[PDB]
């Protein structure tokens, strides 16, 4: 006579209790503008990110992209209030903790300066979640004066227990 | 009355249902040749990587290694059709999604050029899995002309929900 709460479910067809399949992997996409924020510079770039829900971890998969110039430090804001694919709600991206940072990852970049591409690395950390706005801080890295940045693919994940 | 599907199991000895212990940690090793692929250069090096299955994540643990020279970009192909330790099947390494990249990590290297070791980094992403061959793309990084690469230890993981 007991019931089962997600991710536990009762397969009435076979009278079997199991862990839900979507708990292991739930894919999606967010289409929108990635907001870069710095007191002296701010811009918006049209991006499409792949999302993966694996256990209580949400994975953000940034594809390769070319963006405007950035400061030696900066903030990345992804507004999940809109742009999520079908089946996803804005709440499904809320982290399960307020610890800062939740996770840090490194991104490979190329700074373009007067016709030369300079290899550098850029650190990214999950820092804040405010009302559907995810704030990914860019602490720093090797830097040089540049005109635009070429971003290699990179992924970052943080704990999320919403659904 | 109902039965339980993995990782849920019924301990008949104590009449208790629990999560399988191996679900939390399942270790193993893959022994074989690591294949580097680039149109102008390709080689094979004998390597042994440690594998551990934690929840729906498969972790690859690369030990320190010394390899031949590499291009500024490249792909690493690990053929899991053979070489896995006892208890592991080739299917146990298949990712749970096709998103590219599944995850990216950085590897520390030293490039050898005429007797000088130059510290550099390599971005690595899990990109493709085809009939047991795992494709780890090396998007780029700091580079210099070199004769051989010394690779620091590094780990990379991607979601896998197979058995």
């Amino acid at each position: 006579l007991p019931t089962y709460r997600y991710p536990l479910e009762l397969d009435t067809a076979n009278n079997r209790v199991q862990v839900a399949d979507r708990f292991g992997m739930r894919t999606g996409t967010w289409t929108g503008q990635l907001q870069y924020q710095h007191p002296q510079l701010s811009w918006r770039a049209n991006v499409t990110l792949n999302l993966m829900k694996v256990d209580d971890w949400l994975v953000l998969s940034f594809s390769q992209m070319t963006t405007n110039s950035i400061m030696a430090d900066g903030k990345f804001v992804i507004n999940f209030v809109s742009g999520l694919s079908s089946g996803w709600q804005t709440g499904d991206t809320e982290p399960s903790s307020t610890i800062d940072p939740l996770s840090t990852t490194f991104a490979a970049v190329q700074f373009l300066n007067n016709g030369q591409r300079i290899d550098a690395f850029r650190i990214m950390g999950v820092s804040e979640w405010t009302d559907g706005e995810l704030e990914i801080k860019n602490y720093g890295g090797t830097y040089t004066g540049h005109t635009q940045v070429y971003w290699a693919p990179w992924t970052i994940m943080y704990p999320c227990n919403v659904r | 009355l109902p039965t339980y599907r993995y990782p849920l199991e019924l301990d008949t000895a104590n009449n208790r249902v629990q999560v399988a212990d191996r679900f939390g940690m399942r270790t193993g090793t893959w022994t074989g040749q690591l294949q580097y692929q680039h149109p102008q250069l390709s080689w094979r090096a004998n390597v042994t990587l440690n594998l551990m299955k934690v929840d729906d994540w498969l972790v690859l643990s690369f030990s320190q290694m010394t390899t031949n020279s590499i291009m500024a970009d490249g792909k690493f192909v690990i053929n899991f059709v053979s070489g896995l330790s006892s208890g592991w099947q080739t299917g146990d390494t298949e990712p749970s999604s096709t998103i590219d990249p599944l995850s990216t990590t950085f590897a520390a290297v030293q490039f050898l050029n005429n007797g000088q070791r130059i510290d550099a980094f390599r971005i690595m992403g899990v990109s493709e899995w085809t009939d047991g061959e795992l494709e780890i793309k090396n998007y780029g990084g700091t580079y210099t002309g070199h004769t051989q690469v010394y690779w620091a230890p590094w780990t990379i993981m991607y979601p896998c929900n197979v058995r």
Partner: antibody
Amino acid sequence: QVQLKQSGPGLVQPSQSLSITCTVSGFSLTNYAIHWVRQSPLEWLGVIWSGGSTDYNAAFISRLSISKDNFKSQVFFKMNSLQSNDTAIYYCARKEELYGYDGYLFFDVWGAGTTVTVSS
Amino acid sequence: DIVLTQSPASLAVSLGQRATISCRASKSVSTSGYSYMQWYQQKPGQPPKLLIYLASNLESGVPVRFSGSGSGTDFTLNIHPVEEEDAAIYYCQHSRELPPTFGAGTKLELKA
């Protein structure tokens, strides 16, 4: 069809403005850089990078100006001062903007060119 | 700046006989083991079509016969199978410096 066409006056008077407009149909200009070359009896003049940044030839600065519109998928070239020497077929060339080390100063696809003859 | 000079100005070769075009650069276009040069086939009345990117790499849709090899200071391309299609003029271009300069054109004439 991934093809790009540019429109502009064929003949320009001396000391007139030679302006050609390049239109892209297959690729989003936000991902590609559009270059400009002139073939006289091939010279690289300028490039507009994705994101609006422009770099011109050192010896041609202040006589050529390049702008682009991404929402309209157009690249605009305007030259202010003309001489007898600057008579050539002008072409707009394309390069993809990727993080890969492809040695980026190259041209993947070439538009038809506009024939420029300097005569009053 | 960075000047390139091709050799020769006119090349008279028969089909299936390799004609080698040498492009020599004022400064070494190769850096850190990579060579930043490009070769083009400009047909009469048509814009140039890229043949080789970087060093010895064939662009998509380019015949396998076209091949070039060379180091930073000077680059040469040799093409042993020469069919009727490839009768156009060839230019060499360098991608290292901020202003890329096309090399002097080389004219290939198929003999009949």
